[PDB]
Amino acid sequence: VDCSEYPKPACTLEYRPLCGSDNKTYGNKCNFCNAVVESNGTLTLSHFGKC
Numbered sequence: 001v002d003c004s005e006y007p008k009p010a011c012t013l014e015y016r017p018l019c020g021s022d023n024k025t026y027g028n029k030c031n032f033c034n035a036v037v038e039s040n041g042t043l044t045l046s047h048f049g050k051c
């Protein structure tokens with residue numbers, strides 16, 4: 001997924017789960033993309049929805 005607009009200093013509370021390649025269910029795209037940046041691009045998206 002496109003994380004170009006990230007990192008962002010805050011994420012909203014909109015709960016739209018997505019499952020990272022680490023088997024964490026991130027709360028929304030903002031939280032996931034911030035983690036992708038934090039990971040130096042090693043985290044990817046497994047699927048939308050809960051792991």
Ligand SMILES: [Cl-]
Nearest residue numbers: 017049050051
């Ligand atoms: Cl459910």
